[PDB]
Design a protein around this motif. Structure first.
Motif, PDB file in Angstrom:
ATOM      1  N   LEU A 139      -4.537  -1.883 -10.206  1.00  0.00           N
ATOM      2  CA  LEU A 139      -3.768  -1.570  -9.012  1.00  0.00           C
ATOM      3  C   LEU A 139      -4.692  -1.174  -7.860  1.00  0.00           C
ATOM      4  N   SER A 140      -5.737  -0.396  -8.157  1.00  0.00           N
ATOM      5  CA  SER A 140      -6.752  -0.105  -7.147  1.00  0.00           C
ATOM      6  C   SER A 140      -7.501  -1.368  -6.741  1.00  0.00           C
ATOM      7  N   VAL A 151      -8.186  -5.705  -2.695  1.00  0.00           N
ATOM      8  CA  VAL A 151      -7.825  -7.049  -2.252  1.00  0.00           C
ATOM      9  C   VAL A 151      -7.128  -6.988  -0.899  1.00  0.00           C
ATOM     10  N   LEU A 178     -10.478 -12.123  -5.272  1.00  0.00           N
ATOM     11  CA  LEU A 178      -9.212 -12.585  -5.826  1.00  0.00           C
ATOM     12  C   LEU A 178      -9.391 -13.174  -7.218  1.00  0.00           C
ATOM     13  N   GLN A 207     -11.607 -12.101  -9.469  1.00  0.00           N
ATOM     14  CA  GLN A 207     -11.685 -10.967 -10.387  1.00  0.00           C
ATOM     15  C   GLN A 207     -10.327 -10.284 -10.534  1.00  0.00           C
ATOM     16  N   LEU A 208      -9.529 -10.258  -9.462  1.00  0.00           N
ATOM     17  CA  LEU A 208      -8.175  -9.718  -9.572  1.00  0.00           C
ATOM     18  C   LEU A 208      -7.330 -10.552 -10.530  1.00  0.00           C
ATOM     19  N   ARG A 251      -4.991 -11.544 -15.952  1.00  0.00           N
ATOM     20  CA  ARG A 251      -5.020 -12.230 -17.240  1.00  0.00           C
ATOM     21  C   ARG A 251      -5.292 -11.251 -18.372  1.00  0.00           C
ATOM     22  N   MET A 276       1.945   1.699  -3.431  1.00  0.00           N
ATOM     23  CA  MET A 276       0.714   2.185  -4.051  1.00  0.00           C
ATOM     24  C   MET A 276       0.611   3.698  -3.968  1.00  0.00           C
ATOM     25  N   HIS A 301      -8.519 -12.345 -12.948  1.00  0.00           N
ATOM     26  CA  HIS A 301      -9.059 -12.076 -14.276  1.00  0.00           C
ATOM     27  C   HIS A 301      -8.485 -10.791 -14.855  1.00  0.00           C
ATOM     28  N   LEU A 348      -6.088  -4.298  -6.613  1.00  0.00           N
ATOM     29  CA  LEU A 348      -5.151  -4.903  -5.669  1.00  0.00           C
ATOM     30  C   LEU A 348      -5.259  -4.251  -4.296  1.00  0.00           C
ATOM     31  N   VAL A 349      -5.460  -2.929  -4.266  1.00  0.00           N
ATOM     32  CA  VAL A 349      -5.675  -2.237  -2.996  1.00  0.00           C
ATOM     33  C   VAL A 349      -6.914  -2.776  -2.294  1.00  0.00           C
ATOM     34  N   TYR A 357     -19.249 -14.805 -17.485  1.00  0.00           N
ATOM     35  CA  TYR A 357     -18.793 -14.312 -18.780  1.00  0.00           C
ATOM     36  C   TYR A 357     -17.666 -15.172 -19.340  1.00  0.00           C
ATOM     37  N   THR A 375       0.824  -1.202   0.000  1.00  0.00           N
ATOM     38  CA  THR A 375       0.000   0.000   0.000  1.00  0.00           C
ATOM     39  C   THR A 375       0.862   1.258   0.000  1.00  0.00           C
TER      40      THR A 375
END
Lengths: 61, 136, 169, 25, 98
Positions: B44-45, B50, B11, B13-14, B19, A56, B16, B47-48, D3, A53
């Motif tokens: 990156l947001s 997460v 996680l 969706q992160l 990828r 970040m 995804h 990941l934040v 999806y 963070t």
């Protein structure tokens, strides 16, 4: 037109001020704060995600 | 289970998004700079988010106890079990913070409180500086 | 002084498996010499008591399968504290123990039996022994973030700007 | 619905970094 | 294909009894890594600002060359090049309007 440029520069300046204050507070209290009182709100739960963070904040600013 | 379910979906969706950014970087031609910035900021947001959500539900994750299935065969899938079991960091990060601590290197406590007072003073000083000039 | 965490600590005893071999009968005997087996546990006390006497879902299945496990309860119900008990077994290669501590609260007003509370996880895979997933996840995420930081700083180094075009490469 | 599922990103080639040390008796 | 999935089941383990031992060191070492992050923050910002200053003064050098190299009445406009497609300055000097 020109009024739109005026407004855009307005959010430009306020965003500079806000991100400046944000990076100032982040770097000043980058030293993590531990206070026994419930009023304080500073949490460092997962050790290395704290550094994640931090970088970040660096990349964002 | 609810906390781990939320961790799972976020996680997923992160991963995804990872990828995604991967298969748009793998192209031989680099896209426009702006699309790269948008993808970077979004991922990156994410990941934040997460990190924050993993922070929120530490108690549920800690309370859970790991145990292999009775039906899961370890004789044939011992390699797969060991793959997920291992948790030691990658070495380069290890010597990375070792050199970091080497460079950094009651006395420590009073330096800590001196840092406290410098932080508070700087915050107050910049509040005063912001108040000095009308920004509206 | 740098200590390797006991969770990742893995012991190998080729001499013991060569002499005795891997079996549910001596799996506790195999575990006895390991560092993870605390000498303060009541199991060791029971072991010296037995030695002195001689000198002088699947939980119910493994409960009913072996009589030495019976003897384990009738020698362990009397002593409350940190004790080592088997969790499950699938032959001929997989055994896991159940690391629990017992507090026999015989106080008035509690109709429940002795309290059983987990302490640790131990997995016997082959001749090897394994002992938080939160740490695994945070470690993976932080290493991923470090690699992402390296990639992004390299990419920003590659970036070149001109006023008349914008940013290009 | 869903999806798209996630592509299998297994890395068996990863050598792992398990520390081995308590082998001597 | 590996297994029918029922792998993860809920379980309970108690929280370890706290003491002075590990939180104070955890938080002071977090202070350490964040002081690190501040150091690399300052270093990266300094490098970025040095690069930006050097480049930026370069385009002010070209900018001043352009400003003090151009004279003036003349029909000047921006046109899109057939080959390049970008905007470039063009001057009409023909006798078409004369």
């Amino acid at each position: 037109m020109s009024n739109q440029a005026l407004y855009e520069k307005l959010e430009q300046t306020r965003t500079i001020l806000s991100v400046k204050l944000a990076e100032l507070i982040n770097m000043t209290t980058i030293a993590d704060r531990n206070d026994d009182d419930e009023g304080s709100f500073a949490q460092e739960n997962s050790e290395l995600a704290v550094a994640t963070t931090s970088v970040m904040m660096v990349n964002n600013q | 289970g609810q906390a781990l379910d939320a961790v799972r979906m976020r996680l997923a969706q992160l991963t995804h998004s990872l990828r995604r950014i991967r298969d748009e970087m793998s192209k031989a031609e680099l896209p426009q700079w702006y699309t790269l910035q948008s993808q970077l900021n979004v991922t990156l947001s994410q990941l934040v988010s997460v990190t924050s959500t993993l922070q929120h539900f530490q108690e549920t994750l800690d309370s859970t106890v790991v145990y292999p299935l009775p039906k899961f065969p370890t004789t044939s899938h011992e390699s797969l079990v060991t793959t997920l079991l291992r948790k030691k960091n990658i070495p380069e990060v290890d010597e990375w913070m070792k050199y970091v601590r080497e460079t950094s290197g009651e006395e420590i406590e009073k330096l800590l409180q001196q840092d406290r007072e410098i932080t508070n003073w700087a915050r107050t000083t910049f509040r005063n500086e912001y108040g000095k000039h009308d920004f509206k | 002084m740098n200590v390797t965490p006991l969770d990742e600590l893995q012991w190998k005893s080729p001499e013991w498996i060569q002499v005795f071999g891997l079996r549910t009968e001596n799996v506790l005997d195999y575990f006895a010499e390991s560092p993870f087996f605390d000498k303060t546990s009541n199991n060791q006390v029971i072991k010296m008591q037995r030695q002195f006497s001689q000198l002088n879902p699947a939980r119910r299945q493994i409960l009913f399968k072996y009589p030495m496990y019976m003897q384990l309860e009738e020698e362990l119900m009397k002593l409350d504290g940190t004790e080592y008990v088997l969790s499950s077994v699938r032959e001929p290669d997989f055994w896991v123990i159940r690391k629990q501590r017992r507090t026999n609260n015989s106080g008035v007003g509690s109709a429940k039996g002795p309290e059983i509370i987990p302490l640790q996880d131990y997995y016997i895979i082959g001749a090897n022994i394994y002992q938080t997933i939160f740490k695994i996840v945070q470690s993976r995420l932080m290493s991923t973030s470090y690699h992402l930081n390296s990639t992004l700083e390299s990419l920003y180094d590659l970036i070149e700007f001109q006023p008349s075009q914008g940013v290009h490469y | 619905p869903s999806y798209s599922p996630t592509s299998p990103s297994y890395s068996p080639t990863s050598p792992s970094y398990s520390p081995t040390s308590p082998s001597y008796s | 294909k590996v297994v029918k999935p029922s792998s993860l089941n809920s379980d309970k383990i108690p929280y370890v009894a706290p003491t002075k031992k590990e939180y104070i060191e955890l938080d002071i070492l977090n202070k350490g890594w964040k002081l690190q992050s501040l150091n690399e923050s300052k270093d990266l910002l300094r490098a970025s600002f040095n690069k930006l200053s050097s480049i930026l003064q370069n385009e002010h050098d070209y900018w001043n060359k352009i400003m003090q190299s151009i004279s003036n009445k003349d029909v000047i406009f921006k046109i899109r090049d057939r080959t390049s497609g970008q905007k470039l300055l063009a001057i009409k000097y023909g006798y078409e309007d004369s």
